[PDB]
Amino acid sequence: GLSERGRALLLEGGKALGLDLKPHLEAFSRLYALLQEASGKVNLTALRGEEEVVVKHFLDSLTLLRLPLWQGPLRVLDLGTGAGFPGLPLKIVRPELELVLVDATRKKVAFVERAIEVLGLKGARALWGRAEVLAREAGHREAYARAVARAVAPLCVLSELLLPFLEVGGAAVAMKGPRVEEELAPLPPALERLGGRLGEVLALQLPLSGEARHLVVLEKTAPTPPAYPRRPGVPERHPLC
Ligand SMILES: C[S@@+](CC[C@H](N)C(=O)[O-])C[C@H]1O[C@@H](n2cnc3c(N)ncnc32)[C@H](O)[C@@H]1O
């Protein structure tokens, strides 16, 4: 679990994000333990340091909350969640959200489900599948108020993966690093074809790290055309921009 120092870092970082993480210290400590346990099994690799996990993953995920987009029982998709980021931190601090965490890798879906159970989270589930396939399902196509994604794909690709999941009026957040100018430059025309438009591009400093970040908001302004998203692998191989 999180050390006293680890808790203090999380707490301080949360404040800089405008959050009171005091009621959530235990949950994050429990999640960190889960990550430790899982990582321990693998012999070639190890979990990154406590401080790096708290700052570059717990707090990084929580930067989503700098955007005023998470009030009420919103239906949210975490696309390509991996080990549950940024989805799990988001769900912990915003319990009202109806969260579906998707990943094409079954073993990661299994971990997230385990974390949900262990943390005793309600209104959150992991789902095994490809974004391109799920976005063709009556259960999921344009059925989300929100979608988020970190470290999945360049904006041109990611926009095709995310936008089809959103109901009109909804919004997705593409979490990005220090530089986005190049990825953004050719984006607008592609967004429009997808029925989206660029919302806020919130530049901020990741607290306690010295590193810049960008939260790229993709608003759903109109229905996505039947063409999108294209079959699995196609957005990646033939990006819209
Ligand atoms: C680099 S990991 C990032 C994990 C997590 N989002 C994070 O930031 O820590 C990218 C994850 O997205 C998943 N992924 C990539 N493309 C996907 C797709 N088209 N549909 C579902 N999952 C996808 C991969 O399986 C992988 O686990």
UniProtKB/Swiss-Prot annotation:
Coiled coil: none
Annotated region described as RNA binding, given as residue ranges: 237-238
This protein's record includes keyword S-adenosyl-L-methionine: yes
Enzyme class: transferase
Known EC number: 2.1.1.170
Binding site for S-adenosyl-L-methionine: G80, F85, D103, A104, T105, A131, E132, R150
Cystine crosslinks: C156-C241
Subcellular location: Cytoplasm
Keyword Cytoplasm: yes
Reaction it catalyzes: guanosine(527) in 16S rRNA + S-adenosyl-L-methionine = N(7)-methylguanosine(527) in 16S rRNA + S-adenosyl-L-homocysteine
Functional note: Specifically methylates the N7 position of guanine in position 527 of 16S rRNA. Shows a marked preference for deproteinized 16S rRNA as substrate and is completely inactive with native 30S subunits as substrate.
Name the record gives this protein: Ribosomal RNA small subunit methyltransferase G
Natural source organism: Thermus thermophilus (strain ATCC 27634 / DSM 579 / HB8)
